[PDB]
Design a protein around this ligand. Structure first.
Ligand SMILES: CC[C@]1(O)C[C@@H]2CN(CCc3c([nH]c4ccccc34)[C@@](C(=O)OC)(c3cc4c(cc3OC)N(C)[C@H]3[C@@](O)(C(=O)OC)[C@H](OC(C)=O)[C@]5(CC)C=CCN6CC[C@]43[C@@H]65)C2)C1
Ligand SMILES: CC[C@@H](/C=C(/C)[C@@H]1C[C@@H](OC)C[C@H](O)C(C)(C)[C@@]2(O)O[C@@H](C[C@H](OC)[C@@H](O)C(=O)O1)C[C@@H](OC)[C@@H]2O)CO
Ligand SMILES: C/C(=C\c1csc(C)n1)[C@H]1C[C@H]2O[C@H]2CCC[C@@H](C)[C@H](O)[C@@H](C)C(=O)C(C)(C)[C@@H](O)CC(=O)O1
Ligand SMILES: Nc1nc2c(ncn2[C@@H]2O[C@H](COP(=O)(O)OP(=O)(O)OP(=O)(O)O)[C@@H](O)[C@H]2O)c(=O)[nH]1
Ligand SMILES: Nc1nc2c(ncn2[C@@H]2O[C@H](COP(=O)(O)OP(=O)(O)O)[C@@H](O)[C@H]2O)c(=O)[nH]1
Ligand SMILES: [Ca+2]
Ligand SMILES: [Mg+2]
Ligand SMILES: [Mg+2]
Lengths: 440, 429
């Protein structure tokens, strides 16, 4: 029980899903044809990985996942790739014409022609669950499909599953790899439309990831392949609580309680350590102390911002591999003193800590060194508002002149939807300001 | 005579299981419910906690409740797990998410009637039921939210039976979850109005004992829970074994609770000595007695020297002269008489039982009703208002249908309770 359904939307959502499911298979020992020689219960079972894999009578372990895109070329690569035998053809849904980087086409003109079919495939997956926990939705902010169609899907999921929880994994745009000049528009529109339908969203800043790959992995010009492989390690760390079980393993829902103090404030900042190449790790055994310390370096954040200039409302450390409580205690004790970690005065307990004993794994031919221990930190800091500020400024510059707006209006949108989306962003920036203010 | 026992949630089922494990060993019951004891003293009062099944099989009069199956399997697959009646497992699948509102009003609402059915079936099998005992924590969702819902429903069907709980308070030293002060405060509110006697087992105190006194550098719940089972066995000795006391739960309430709301007890256990060079020394009654009253031995993290005892019950177990125990207990009072209120004459009582706990030649169990317990409620109150000042994490509870007012009147009740303890700390004759 406690099953989770994954929904991968648009190019970024699809390609990141491919990276994730390959990593999951390696972690659980599932083969590219779905066989899992380790699994003794055939046809079913209530094991931990069953939260993400269903089983067929023949012993196939099938991702509880839907890939959807408005054009075919990206999902076509899944249909013909190493793990093509892993998915049933109906879990891969493609259109003929994409959103053209236009939220309006994704939410309306094109999306409305495939939404019912997508919601149908999802129902079929939900019907195979005994205790469906919720959804994980992977998408870009900038794409026409990642923004517009993802919004439509989320609104539809609220209608069909009520309060059932929906978590987002979102790619925040960066000029170093951005495919469209209008991505700030699509970003604000999808964030406005989705804010009240999402329980918790993990933002990944492409520029942050881009820089980490360049600096820590020694890749001069990172590609999506480099970025997604790193992203997948963060995703694996967050879901590892659900796919494995350990005496010190703590569930992601217990983290969510600590991470979301108010409905709208549901955007944790992620970090991950160690990020190091085989060459550098050859002569360097990284201790719990070193990787814990790295979580508080501004340059290791998955979104570009400065948490020293903000206040923490929560820190959750998800350790995995060779880690024992004594070492964690000493590590945090050190960090508390040598660092300037400021918590709001309304949060009595700021740290939550768990250990998953499953060691980190890496895909052969990847860029990450294989390490004995790793840590992922999810924190809720007001500093993440800096990312909203930067987006909103790019929006305002273009919108003041109505640049490109005719593309959205021509597709059926009104200007009011723009300024409504922008005003919502203004309130969000203010909300992050007020939670940080000391109590009277 | 007969007592019906209920354990709810993870913590409640954890310590509830160790309790049955420990007293089953004392009464000579093996994990299959067969009697393999020597003395018959172990069967004199066996019916207090056990039902006699066909074939000289004794089965605990226990009801196991939880909103998730996990701990159900755990108990059922452990030592003494086969001893329990299989009908008396009542669990759900949703879980409570450490959310008091889910345990008390939404998810627990559906399971509650199934529990009342088993409760009702056990009560009718009793010759003369004296009352109920509940094990649960206050920091979670099921034991806290649904445990108190159970208390309220049970009181409405058995309004004149004694209601007694072993309640584990949450501590940031042990637990990570930010909403625990919320769950505990809502629970304390229910406990002051619907229980007759509550043992305050403070995870903050249990941690200090394991870390400071016992020198346990990596304490586990198994360590903490082995302190709880030892204390639970001690405080129930005079129910399960005959001798010199003609006492049940009602008599204990009458003489321990001088004012209805002041029914939260401070427990303690001796001996406590870290491994291991001192684990072989012989304990003298003078040493047992000094340890029992030591503030650092208390099982609620509150300094008894800061307040006054309204009432004290002490129970000694093992081979020892009652003369020594008498003299020692009188020494403590005569030599520190300012820590006992003078408007309740002779307010510290002693019982001695011949059978000692397993592994120990002697032992003492302390039950103190002290004004200093307010420090416990102050601590939880400070954590509560720090959060509630800003309505932080409130949406987890309002999304289950709760109002802010319900929180306001829970904190209000706890603040008054604090006030009441303070007023007898300064009351004089
Ligand atoms: C008795 C049950 C228990 O085992 C008790 C502690 C906590 N948990 C599980 C195990 C555990 C512990 N530490 C872990 C670290 C990672 C993963 C698991 C653990 C445990 C330990 O070291 O011995 C086994 C422990 C934990 C803590 C702990 C002590 C402790 O064992 C000694 N501390 C009391 C708190 C703590 O917050 C604190 O106040 O400082 C002392 C503490 O802070 C620091 C800097 O040590 C710390 C350590 C990770 C930090 C953040 C979260 N809080 C929660 C409680 C606290 C911890 C033991 C439950
Ligand atoms: C009894 C009332 C109320 C407080 C009082 C006054 C009690 C009295 C007696 O309790 C056992 C103490 C006893 O007389 C002693 C001095 C011999 C003794 O045992 O004291 C403890 C130190 C203890 O620290 C907590 C002390 O402060 C304390 O608790 O004092 C070790 C050691 O200290 C030198 C000494 O061996 C507690 O219920
Ligand atoms: C202090 C003890 C005994 C003792 C004191 S002097 C003497 C000759 N024996 C007992 C106390 C028992 O009430 C039980 C709680 C103890 C918890 C322990 C299981 C603890 O977890 C562990 C670290 C221990 O302290 C020992 C295993 C060494 C235990 O035997 C001593 C102890 O505390 O038990
Ligand atoms: N990290 C990462 N970002 C990606 C990837 N593919 C695209 N992006 C980013 O996503 C944005 C473009 O959105 P896409 O996902 O390509 O677009 P789409 O959802 O297919 O939308 P349309 O093609 O317009 O229908 C840009 O900011 C890209 O840098 C990927 O594999 N990884
Ligand atoms: N002493 C003790 N406390 C426990 C144990 N298990 C959980 N707790 C505490 O109980 C609280 C959480 O409640 P829990 O019983 O887990 O939740 P529930 O299942 O919803 O009732 C926290 O304060 C935990 O530290 C245990 O075995 N022993
Ligand atoms: Ca299986
Ligand atoms: Mg596309
Ligand atoms: Mg729990």
């Amino acid at each position: 029980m406690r099953e989770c359904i994954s929904i991968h939307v648009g190019q970024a959502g699809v390609q990141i899903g491919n990276a994730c499911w390959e990593l999951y298979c390696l972690e659980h020992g599932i083969q590219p044809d779905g066989q899992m020689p380790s699994d003794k219960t055939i046809g079913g079972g209530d094991d931990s990985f069953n939260t993400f894999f269903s089983e067929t009578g023949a012993g196939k372990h099938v991702p509880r996942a839907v890939f959807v895109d408005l054009e075919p070329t990206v999902i076509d690569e899944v249909r013909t790739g190493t793990y093509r035998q892993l998915f049933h053809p109906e879990q891969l849904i493609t259109g003929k014409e994409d959103a053209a980087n236009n939220y309006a086409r994704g939410h309306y003109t094109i999306g409305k022609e495939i939404i019912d079919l997508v919601l149908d495939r999802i129902r079929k997956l939900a019907d195979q669950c005994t205790g469906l926990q919720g959804f994980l939705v992977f998408h870009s902010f900038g794409g026409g499909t990642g923004s517009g169609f993802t919004s439509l899907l989320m609104e539809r999921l609220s209608v069909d599953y009520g309060k059932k929880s929906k978590l987002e994994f979102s790619i925040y745009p960066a000029p170093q790899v951005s495919t469209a000049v209008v991505e700030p528009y699509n970003s604000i529109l999808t964030t406005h439309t989705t804010l009240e339908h999402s329980d918790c969203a993990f933002m990944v800043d492409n520029e942050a990831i881009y820089d980490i790959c360049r600096r820590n992995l020694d890749i001069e010009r990172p590609t999506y392949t480099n970025l997604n492989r790193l992203i997948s390690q963060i995703v694996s760390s967050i879901t590892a609580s659900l796919r494995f079980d350990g005496a010190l393993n703590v569930d992601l829902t217990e983290f969510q309680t600590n991470l979301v103090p108010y409905p709208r404030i549901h955007f944790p900042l992620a970090t991950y350590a160690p990020v190091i190449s085989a060459e550098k790790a050859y002569h360097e055994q990284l201790s719990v102390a070193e990787i814990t310390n790295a979580c508080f370096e501004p340059a290791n954040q998955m979104v570009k911002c400065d948490p020293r200039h903000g206040k923490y409302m929560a820190c959750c450390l998800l350790y995995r591999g060779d880690v024992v409580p004594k070492d964690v205690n000493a590590a945090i004790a050190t960090i508390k003193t040598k660092r300037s970690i400021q918590f709001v005065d309304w949060c009595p307990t700021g740290f939550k800590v768990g250990i998953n004993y499953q060691p980190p794994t890496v895909v052969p031919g990847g860029d990450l060194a294989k390490v004995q221990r790793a840590v992922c930190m999810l924190s809720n800091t007001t500093a993440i508002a800096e990312a909203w500020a930067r987006l909103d400024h790019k929006f305002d510059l273009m919108y003041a002149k109505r640049a490109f707006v005719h593309w959205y209006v021509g597709e059926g949108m009104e200007e009011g939807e723009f300024s409504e989306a922008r005003e919502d962003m203004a309130a969000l920036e203010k909300d992050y300001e007020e939670v940080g203010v000391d109590s009277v | 005579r007969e007592i019906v026992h209920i354990q709810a949630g993870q913590c409640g089922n954890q310590i509830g299981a160790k309790f049955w494990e420990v007293i089953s060993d004392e009464h000579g019951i093996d994990p299959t419910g067969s009697y393999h004891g020597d003395s018959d003293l172990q069967l004199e009062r066996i019916n207090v906690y056990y039902n006699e099944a066909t074939g000289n099989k004794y089965v605990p009069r226990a009801i196991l409740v939880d909103l998730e199956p996990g701990t159900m399997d755990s108990v059922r697959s452990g030592p003494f797990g086969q001893i329990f009646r299989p009908d008396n497992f009542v669990f759900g699948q949703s879980g409570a998410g450490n959310n008091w509102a889910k345990g008390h009003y939404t998810e627990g609402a559906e399971l509650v009637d199934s529990v009342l059915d088993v409760v009702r079936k056990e009560s009718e099998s009793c010759d003369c039921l004296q009352g109920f005992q509940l094990t649960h924590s206050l920091g979670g969702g099921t034991g806290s939210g649904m445990g108190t819902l159970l208390i309220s429903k049970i009181r409405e069907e058995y309004p004149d039976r004694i209601m007694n709980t072993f309640s584990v308070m949450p501590s940031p030293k042990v637990s990570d979850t930010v909403v625990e002060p919320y769950n505990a405060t809502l629970s304390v509110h229910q406990l002051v109005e619907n229980t007759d006697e509550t043992y305050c087992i403070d995870n903050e105190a249990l941690y200090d004992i394991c870390f400071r006194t016992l020198k346990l550098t990596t304490p586990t719940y198994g360590d903490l829970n082995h302190l709880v089972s030892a204390t639970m066995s001690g405080v129930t000795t005079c129910l399960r074994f005959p001798g010199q006391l003609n006492a049940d739960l009602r008599k204990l309430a009458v003489n321990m609770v001088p004012f209805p709301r002041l029914h939260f007890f401070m427990p303690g256990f001796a001996p406590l000595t870290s491994r291991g060079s001192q684990q072989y020394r012989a304990l003298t009654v003078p040493e047992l007695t000094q340890q029992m009253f030591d503030s650092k031995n208390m099982m609620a993290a509150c300094d008894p020297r800061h307040g006054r005892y309204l009432t004290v019950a002490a129970i000694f177990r093992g081979r020892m002269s009652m003369k020594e125990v008498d003299e020692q207990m009188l020494n403590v009072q005569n030599k520190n008489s300012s820590y006992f209120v003078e408007w309740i004459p002779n307010n510290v009582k002693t019982a001695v039982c011949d059978i000692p706990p397993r592994g120990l030649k002697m032992s003492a169990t302390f039950i103190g009703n002290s004004t200093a317990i307010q420090e416990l409620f102050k601590r939880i109150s400070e954590q509560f208002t720090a959060m509630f000042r800003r309505k932080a994490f409130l949406h987890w509870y309002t999304g289950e249908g709760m109002d802010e007012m319900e929180f306001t009147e829970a904190e209000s009740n706890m603040n008054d309770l604090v006030s009441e303890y303070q007023q007898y700390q300064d009351a004089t004759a």
